[PDB]
Design an enzyme around this catalytic site. Structure first.
Site, PDB file in Angstrom:
ATOM      1  N   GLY A  10     -75.828  16.553  19.990  1.00  0.00           N
ATOM      2  CA  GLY A  10     -76.783  15.642  19.223  1.00  0.00           C
ATOM      3  C   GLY A  10     -77.560  13.636  20.097  1.00  0.00           C
ATOM      4  O   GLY A  10     -77.593  13.733  21.638  1.00  0.00           O
ATOM      5  N   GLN A  11     -78.039  13.223  19.362  1.00  0.00           N
ATOM      6  CA  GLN A  11     -78.713  12.528  19.725  1.00  0.00           C
ATOM      7  C   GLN A  11     -78.406  11.243  20.473  1.00  0.00           C
ATOM      8  O   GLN A  11     -78.228  10.432  21.886  1.00  0.00           O
ATOM      9  CB  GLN A  11     -79.913  11.850  19.200  1.00  0.00           C
ATOM     10  CG  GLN A  11     -80.902  10.681  19.658  1.00  0.00           C
ATOM     11  CD  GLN A  11     -82.011  10.520  18.728  1.00  0.00           C
ATOM     12  OE1 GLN A  11     -81.833  10.567  17.336  1.00  0.00           O
ATOM     13  NE2 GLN A  11     -83.041   9.761  19.323  1.00  0.00           N
ATOM     14  N   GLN A  15     -77.817  10.474  24.742  1.00  0.00           N
ATOM     15  CA  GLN A  15     -78.312  10.362  25.675  1.00  0.00           C
ATOM     16  C   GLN A  15     -77.150   8.822  26.241  1.00  0.00           C
ATOM     17  O   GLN A  15     -77.609   8.179  26.943  1.00  0.00           O
ATOM     18  CB  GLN A  15     -78.708   8.716  24.414  1.00  0.00           C
ATOM     19  CG  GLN A  15     -80.480   9.262  23.619  1.00  0.00           C
ATOM     20  CD  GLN A  15     -80.777   8.865  22.293  1.00  0.00           C
ATOM     21  OE1 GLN A  15     -80.077   7.764  22.169  1.00  0.00           O
ATOM     22  NE2 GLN A  15     -82.384   8.461  22.086  1.00  0.00           N
ATOM     23  N   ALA A  91     -79.911  18.987  11.446  1.00  0.00           N
ATOM     24  CA  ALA A  91     -79.620  18.899  10.739  1.00  0.00           C
ATOM     25  C   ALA A  91     -79.815  18.587   9.896  1.00  0.00           C
ATOM     26  O   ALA A  91     -78.856  18.878   8.486  1.00  0.00           O
ATOM     27  CB  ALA A  91     -77.395  18.751  11.085  1.00  0.00           C
ATOM     28  N   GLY A 135     -74.134  11.184  12.126  1.00  0.00           N
ATOM     29  CA  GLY A 135     -74.923  12.710  12.505  1.00  0.00           C
ATOM     30  C   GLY A 135     -74.828  14.151  11.867  1.00  0.00           C
ATOM     31  O   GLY A 135     -73.664  13.598  11.022  1.00  0.00           O
ATOM     32  N   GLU A 175     -73.315   8.728   5.092  1.00  0.00           N
ATOM     33  CA  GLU A 175     -73.110   8.392   6.612  1.00  0.00           C
ATOM     34  C   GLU A 175     -70.944   8.752   6.398  1.00  0.00           C
ATOM     35  O   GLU A 175     -70.560   9.276   6.947  1.00  0.00           O
ATOM     36  CB  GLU A 175     -72.691   7.250   7.283  1.00  0.00           C
ATOM     37  CG  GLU A 175     -73.208   7.366   8.303  1.00  0.00           C
ATOM     38  CD  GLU A 175     -73.765   6.228   8.949  1.00  0.00           C
ATOM     39  OE1 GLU A 175     -73.037   4.869   8.848  1.00  0.00           O
ATOM     40  OE2 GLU A 175     -74.719   5.615  10.581  1.00  0.00           O
ATOM     41  N   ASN A 198     -71.010   0.159  16.978  1.00  0.00           N
ATOM     42  CA  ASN A 198     -72.448   0.130  17.714  1.00  0.00           C
ATOM     43  C   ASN A 198     -72.454  -1.592  16.766  1.00  0.00           C
ATOM     44  O   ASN A 198     -73.308  -2.664  17.739  1.00  0.00           O
ATOM     45  CB  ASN A 198     -73.302   0.413  16.864  1.00  0.00           C
ATOM     46  CG  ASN A 198     -73.739   1.660  17.917  1.00  0.00           C
ATOM     47  OD1 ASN A 198     -73.584   1.551  18.604  1.00  0.00           O
ATOM     48  ND2 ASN A 198     -74.997   2.854  16.989  1.00  0.00           N
ATOM     49  N   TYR A 216     -80.652   0.239  22.847  1.00  0.00           N
ATOM     50  CA  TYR A 216     -79.415   1.095  22.805  1.00  0.00           C
ATOM     51  C   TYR A 216     -79.780   1.436  24.281  1.00  0.00           C
ATOM     52  O   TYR A 216     -77.882   2.344  23.900  1.00  0.00           O
ATOM     53  CB  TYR A 216     -80.032   2.803  21.920  1.00  0.00           C
ATOM     54  CG  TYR A 216     -80.230   2.593  20.156  1.00  0.00           C
ATOM     55  CD1 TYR A 216     -78.442   1.921  19.961  1.00  0.00           C
ATOM     56  CD2 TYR A 216     -80.465   3.350  20.056  1.00  0.00           C
ATOM     57  CE1 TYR A 216     -78.370   2.100  18.378  1.00  0.00           C
ATOM     58  CE2 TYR A 216     -80.024   3.924  18.441  1.00  0.00           C
ATOM     59  CZ  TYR A 216     -79.069   3.074  18.181  1.00  0.00           C
ATOM     60  OH  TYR A 216     -78.625   3.192  16.395  1.00  0.00           O
ATOM     61  N   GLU A 246     -51.903  12.254  30.791  1.00  0.00           N
ATOM     62  CA  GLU A 246     -51.178  10.910  30.477  1.00  0.00           C
ATOM     63  C   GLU A 246     -51.708   9.745  29.912  1.00  0.00           C
ATOM     64  O   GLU A 246     -50.710   9.187  28.318  1.00  0.00           O
ATOM     65  CB  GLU A 246     -51.797   9.816  32.120  1.00  0.00           C
ATOM     66  CG  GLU A 246     -50.097  10.780  32.936  1.00  0.00           C
ATOM     67  CD  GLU A 246     -49.190  10.589  32.132  1.00  0.00           C
ATOM     68  OE1 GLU A 246     -47.709   9.580  32.703  1.00  0.00           O
ATOM     69  OE2 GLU A 246     -48.866  11.990  32.266  1.00  0.00           O
TER      70      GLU A 246
END
Ligand SMILES: CC(=O)O[C@H]1C(=O)[C@@]2(C)[C@H]([C@H](OC(=O)c3ccccc3)[C@]3(O)C[C@H](OC(=O)[C@H](O)[C@@H](NC(=O)c4ccccc4)c4ccccc4)C(C)=C1C3(C)C)[C@]1(OC(C)=O)CO[C@@H]1C[C@@H]2O
Ligand SMILES: Nc1nc2c(ncn2[C@@H]2O[C@H](COP(=O)(O)OP(=O)(O)OP(=O)(O)O)[C@@H](O)[C@H]2O)c(=O)[nH]1
Ligand SMILES: Nc1nc2c(ncn2[C@@H]2O[C@H](COP(=O)(O)OP(=O)(O)O)[C@@H](O)[C@H]2O)c(=O)[nH]1
Ligand SMILES: Nc1ncnc2c1ncn2[C@@H]1O[C@H](COP(=O)(O)OP(=O)(O)O)[C@@H](O)[C@H]1O
Ligand SMILES: [Mg+2]
Ligand SMILES: [Mg+2]
EC number: 3.6.5.-
Lengths: 431, 430, 314
Positions: A10-11, A15, A91, A135, A175, A198, A216, A246
């Protein structure tokens, strides 16, 4: 030796991986074109031919825009061309499109590339998967990919670095559907899942770093610092080393509770650096402040279950012990009854590096915390309430139903999330 | 990759298409002759969404020119940027509808549809991965409305899994340019409700109001209105051509903005818009774009969003900005106006950011709002239709082409059901 | 007068699956109580199992509806079940002959009875006539009447075996597994009762629905998938209509009929104006597991409270 394979889908994942790999190349002295101008870095790179280093990464997306940006940018000659996998149509914020319709034409190609990468490996111990809940390709293709990997490999650990949806801040309307569905599908295939919000990163950048326009890039740089702190035990030597096994054996007490929270300290700007004598006790204390948490939830609303502290730089074990004892004697932060010994500490040697043009100062010591707490039950409740509100009137449901998903999957996912909520509430009762 | 086929039908559709193609060509740096003279690689990086590569460094737009009379496309061809189109894509008849929906849907359009579909297929098979179509037309004329609806139905039959977009000029609320616009508008909404993925409704009166109040234009002409519509179109399709920090294509907007299949009629808007003298007195910042977007006087349809509630909202920003600022602005707008957003949908606003700004400006934005206040347009059109239909005025012009009254009754009932649905979805019931 | 009866036909265990290490997730008690597995409690009017034959479900499916389908708008029998349950088998093998060829002989002293019947299917959101080869038809609405299929063919059998001939020709023209994803087949019966009075409006509607497919998990792509998901969306619209017709005390409001051609045909038959009864088929095996207990089973509770009207003896 022991190596790690990183997968970015995904984007958001692409990134974040771009930032992480710029940081990794900077840490080890590797030029943007792969050549070393001057060997513990082979846990992420591979020696090819005559002194060229290729990262052990796979970049996956269903649209060509961001992968093409990577293919044209300054690191165009760092990555293997066949490891940047690209589709044609994304998508479009649809879980069904990514999981059932569009993911099924490149899932085989991605699995073949992963197998080719891991065959060359000789001590593979885990995968690192970067994605976002909200996403379409992120949630859907991540669920499909983890199902395929769990079928194929099984014993290898599979960590996650996911972008949890924010309580108020949002960039999409569908979402909750994608988040609930991907959680339901992935719950039985991921060994661990570290999450950040975010909105909390925006708050940290505004408050600690004093930035009013944190695009971003700054968020991805902070996440890169967290991932670098996690993998420094692999890449560099230290007093105490921590592997990928661990983490899962210490932070996950039950198979359905594997959602730790990642924080970092100190996140400060170069103006306050000269006036602060940052030391082990201070950064350890700062890792526990509710305002410094990187997920928009209050730890004071739940009970801690297991914490992992990762120190790097000029850090002395005795000061770590003293700071941890001081944290333990504090009455304002609570631990579950059935975890008398709930700390895992790792001490490294290499101080964190500074990326030129970044918004962080140069510090001689730093801490990365990963903690498992029941304060995420409120986030689960909020997500479930949003799903219930949007689903009672069957809004946007036809979009998912027309792409191969039956109406029963929504009910299954909702019941599974209710069961997870009950498990979280039951694990936090003292006895 | 993701490519778009453009169709424009009738006088208004042809004029809006000509203006839009001049705008897009100047955006991608293509001369009137069709050669490239730009100064950036991002202009040619994604030229394939709208253009075909011809021989000798030439670019041919993927457009179809449809009309039932030859004069409009004669003027389009003889004008500037008229040699940029492929001559074979000019498909015209000789009779014309004469402001008659029946003539454009059952008498002349039924004869031109084969040629137009042959051209459309020839354009669509050469596509690598067809993303969708896009029709420019109106609802008050004969050829425009009738042939556009016929073409939309035929294309939906041929390509049912694609994306169909429409930029339709709905009849004006105050002054009517044709005596028989209610009939054509009802008979065309009857088809748009079923065969269109998403429809953008634009009113000429709102465009006049924008051009006289915001832009302070003393004498606005149809060129300015077509300029505004072209700006909206480019802003809508900007994410397919340039990279961004957060991008959304047509299908993503359709998924995020259409909760139920029958509710796909949006109202667009643009920002910034200012006069020449007032540009020195303002600062271009994300809060200012956000404030101007959510303005009643800035809407491109003659509907007031304050009379209803928003279902979903899409904002497509362009330029260099910070996602934190955009996100807090959206949160602030949602929290301040909690009475203007539906309760059973949290996070009513969708967002996308594109890196490359429009030529000139450093910042811009596009607004798409799916509001329940658009029911007023349909209710007014239905009232006019049912007032003119009891007396059967002007009806013989429509029933002399084979159309029967059952079709009129079906169209009226379908429009009434759409109005009832839009009205009813203002109730939370929770 | 108001109880939309829901009957559950528990299919016999499949021969290939019976011995292949599976248990039974559906347990039958009697014709009034059913139990799932967890250990959920379910009551759906009458309940049938493998013991009952094809004609043994007549006692609680169509017989106490078709006593004389004149006093009310009467039958609106649907048939859920999804793929492999046996809705098509139950409807089109035997339990449609009890309707006619077995209930065509009903007395004549007080009335003269004649019938008019028609058959249609809904494929890819289009309507076709199954008796005569004709293209897609257009549904037209009006305030006075309901929906009318412009171009449908009406037939008036004056005997009993004519209906068997019509039914037999109405299944070889159905899109029969190009059983799998298919079209919704609707059978419409019009009853005429010219007195030897004008009480003659009654229409009997028999529907054999298709099944909801999961596509990638169990199905295919291209065709059988484009023709698929139309079944899924039409079933979603039907479920929305059913839920909206039985919601608490609000009810009324706006019922989204026009989201599919199937629901438009049921505008005058799914609302409350007739005595209607539902039939659903469930497989007791655990291979399907989830699809056997969902809107297949949960929803039919919500359609046991579809209050209707029958005072209109027309
Ligand atoms: C002093 C000066 O430089 O003025 C600018 C300008 O940007 C201003 C005044 C422009 C100007 O617009 C108008 O005055 C106008 C008049 C009637 C109808 C519509 C617009 C401008 O035309 C707009 C034009 O902007 C562009 O070129 C954009 O890229 C625009 N394209 C075109 O206008 C265009 C026209 C013909 C052929 C090709 C392109 C665009 C807008 C949206 C999406 C894509 C492209 C420019 C630089 C100016 C003038 C000339 C005054 C404004 O318009 C736009 C669309 O940005 C007026 O409100 C804004 C405020 C701007 O500051
Ligand atoms: N922290 C961080 N979050 C990001 C970044 N890019 C996208 N996101 C998050 O991703 C969400 C949007 O969905 P995406 O992850 O972009 O979905 P996608 O991977 O593009 O897949 P599609 O839905 O098919 O377009 C936003 O809410 C952001 O919070 C990033 O660079 N950094
Ligand atoms: N002759 C003719 N007139 C039309 C047609 N479509 C719309 N009109 C009329 O033209 C009026 C405005 O169209 P136009 O000015 O060309 O649109 P604009 O220039 O883009 O704003 C509308 O009110 C319609 O009544 C058509 O196809 N043919
Ligand atoms: N009572 C029953 N006894 C034996 N087999 C049955 C019974 N009911 C259904 N079946 C079987 O289940 C299958 C279901 O197929 P069918 O009803 O034709 O379409 P669908 O699977 O779409 O309902 C049939 O092939 C039939 O043989
Ligand atoms: Mg994307
Ligand atoms: Mg069948």
């Amino acid at each position: 030796m022991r190596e790690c394979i990183s997968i970015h889908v995904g984007q958001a994942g692409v990134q974040i991986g771009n930032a992480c790999w710029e940081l990794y190349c900077l840490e080890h002295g590797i030029q943007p074109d792969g050549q070393m101008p001057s060997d513990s870095f082979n846990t992420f790179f591979s020696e090819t031919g005559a002194g060229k280093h290729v990262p052990r990464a796979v970049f996956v997306d269903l649209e060509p825009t961001v992968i093409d940006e990577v293919r044209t940018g300054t690191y165009r000659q760092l990555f293997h061309p066949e490891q940047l996998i690209t589709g044609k149509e994304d998508a479009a914020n649809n879980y069904a499109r990514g999981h059932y319709t569009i993911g099924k034409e490149i899932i085989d190609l991605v699995l073949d590339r992963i197998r080719k990468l891991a065959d060359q490996c000789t001590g593979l111990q885990g995968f690192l998967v970067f994605h976002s809940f909200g996403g379409g390709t992120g949630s859907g293709f991540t669920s499909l990919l983890m199902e395929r990997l769990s079928v194929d490999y099984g014993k290898k650990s599979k960590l996650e670095f996911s972008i949890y949806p924010a309580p108020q801040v949002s960039t999409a309307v569908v979402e909750p559907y994608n988040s609930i569905l991907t959680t339901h599908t992935t719950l039985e295939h991921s060994d661990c899942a570290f999450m950040v919000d975010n909105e909390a990163i925006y708050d940290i950048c505004r408050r600690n770093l004093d930035i009013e326009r944190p695009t971003y890039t700054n968020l991805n740089r902070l996440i890169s610092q967290i991932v670098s702190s996690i993998t420094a035990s692999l890449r560099f030597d230290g007093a105490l080393n921590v592997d990928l096994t661990e983490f899962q054996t210490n932070l996950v007490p039950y198979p359905r509770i594997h959602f730790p929270l990642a924080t970092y300290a100190p996140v400060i700007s170069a103006e306050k650096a000269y006036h602060e004598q940052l030391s082990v006790a201070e950064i350890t204390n700062a890792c526990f402040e509710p305002a410094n948490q990187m997920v928009k939830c209050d730890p004071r609303h739940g009970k801690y279950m297991a914490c992992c502290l990762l120190y790097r730089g000029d850090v002395v074990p005795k000061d770590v012990n003293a700071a941890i004892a001081t944290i333990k004697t504090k009455r304002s932060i609570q631990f579950v009854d059935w975890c008398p010994t709930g700390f895992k500490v790792g001490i490294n040697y290499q101080p964190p590096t500074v990326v030129p043009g970044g918004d962080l100062a140069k510090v001689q010591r730093a801490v990365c915390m990963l903690s498992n707490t029941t304060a995420i039950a409120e986030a689960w409740a909020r997500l479930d309430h949003k799903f219930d509100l949007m689903y009672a009137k069957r809004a946007f449901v036809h979009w998912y139903v027309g792409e191969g998903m039956e109406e029963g999957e929504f009910s299954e996912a909702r019941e599974d999330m209710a069961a997870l909520e009950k498990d979280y509430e039951e694990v936090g009762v003292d006895s | 990759m993701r490519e778009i086929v453009h169709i424009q039908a009738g006088q208004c559709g042809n004029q809006i298409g000509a203006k839009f193609w001049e705008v897009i060509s100047d955006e991608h740096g293509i001369d009137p002759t069709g050669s490239y003279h730009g100064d950036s690689d991002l202009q040619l990086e994604r030229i394939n969404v709208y253009y075909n590569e011809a021989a000798g460094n030439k670019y041919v737009p993927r457009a179809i020119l449809v009309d039932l009379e030859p004069g409009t496309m004669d003027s389009v061809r003889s004008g500037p940027f008229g040699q940029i189109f492929r001559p074979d894509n000019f498909v015209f008849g000789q009779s014309g509808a004469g402001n008659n929906w029946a003539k454009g849907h059952y008498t002349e359009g039924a004869e031109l549809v084969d040629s137009v579909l042959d051209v459309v297929r020839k354009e669509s098979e050469s596509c690598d991965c067809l993303q969708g179509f896009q029709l420019t037309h109106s609802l008050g004329g004969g050829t425009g409305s009738g042939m556009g609806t016929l073409l939309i139905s035929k294309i939906r039959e041929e390509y049912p899994d694609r994306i169909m977009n429409t930029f339709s000029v709905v009849p004006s609320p105050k002054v009517s340019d044709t005596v028989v616009e209610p009939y054509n508008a009802t008979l065309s909404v009857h088809q748009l409700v079923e065969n269109t993925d998403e429809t953008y409704c634009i009113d000429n009166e709102a465009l006049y109001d924008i051009c006289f109040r915001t832009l302070k234009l003393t004498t606005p002409t149809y060129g300015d209105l077509n300029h505004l519509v072209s700006a909206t179109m480019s802003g809508v399709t900007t994410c397919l051509r340039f990279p961004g920090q957060l991008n959304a294509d047509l299908r993503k907007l359709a998924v995020n903005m259409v909760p139920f299949p029958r509710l796909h009629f949006f109202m667009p808007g643009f920002a910034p818009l200012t006069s020449r003298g007032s540009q020195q007195y303002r600062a271009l910042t994300v809060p200012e774009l956000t404030q101007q977007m959510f303005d009643a006087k800035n809407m491109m349809a003659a509907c007031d969003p304050r009379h209803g509630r928003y279902l979903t909202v899409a904002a497509v920003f362009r330029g260099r900005m910070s996602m934190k600022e955009v996100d807090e602005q959206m949160l602030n707008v949602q929290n301040k106006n909690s009475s203007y957003f539906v309760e059973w949908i949290p996070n009513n606003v969708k967002t996308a950011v594109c890196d490359i700004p429009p030529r000139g400006l450093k910042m811009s934005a596009t607004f798409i709002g799916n509001s329940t206040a658009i029911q007023e347009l349909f209710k007014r059109i239905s009232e006019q239709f049912t007032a003119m239909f009891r007396r059967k005025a002007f009806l013989h012009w429509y029933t002399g082409e084979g159309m029967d009254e059952m079709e009129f009754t079906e169209a009226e009932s379908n429009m009434n059901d759409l109005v009832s649905e839009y009205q009813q979805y203002q109730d939370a019931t929770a | 007068c108001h109880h939309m009866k829901v009957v559950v036909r528990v299919r016999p265990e499949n021969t290939k699956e019976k011995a292949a290490g599976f248990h039974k997730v559906v347990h039958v008690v009697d014709k009034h109580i059913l139990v799932f597995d967890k250990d959920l409690k379910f009551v759906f009017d009458a309940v049938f199992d493998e013991t009952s034959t094809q004609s043994e479900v007549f006692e609680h499916t169509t017989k106490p509806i078709l006593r004389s389908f004149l006093n009310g708008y009467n039958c609106t029998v649907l048939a859920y079940g999804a793929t492999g349950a046996g809705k098509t088998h139950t409807m089109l093998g035997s339990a449609d002959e009890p309707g006619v060829m077995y209930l065509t002989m009903l007395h004549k002293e007080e009335k003269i009875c004649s019938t008019a019947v028609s058959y249609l299917e809904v494929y890819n959101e289009q309507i076709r006539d199954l008796l005569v080869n004709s293209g897609p038809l257009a549904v037209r609405e009006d305030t006075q009447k309901g929906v009318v299929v412009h171009g449908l063919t009406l037939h008036q059998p004056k005997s009993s075996e004519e209906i068997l001939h019509l039914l037999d020709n109405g299944n070889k023209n159905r899109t029969q597994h190009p059983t799998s994803s298919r079209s919704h087949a609707v059978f419409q019966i019009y009853l005429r009762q010219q007195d030897k009075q004008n009480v003659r409006i009654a229409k009997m509607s028999l529907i054999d629905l298709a099944g909801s497919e999961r596509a990638s998990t169990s199905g295919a792509k291209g065709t059988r998938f484009v023709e698929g998901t139309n079944i899924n969306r039409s079933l979603l619209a039907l479920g929305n209509v059913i839920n909206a017709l039985a919601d608490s005390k609000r009810k009324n409001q706006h019922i989204p009929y026009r989201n599919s051609k199937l629901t438009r045909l049921l505008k005058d038959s799914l609302g409350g104006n007739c005595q209607t009864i539902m039939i659903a088929a469930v497989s007791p095996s655990s291979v399907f597991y989830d699809d056997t207990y969902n809107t297949l089973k949960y929803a039919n509770r919500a359609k046991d409270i579809k209050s209707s009207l029958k005072s209109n003896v027309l």
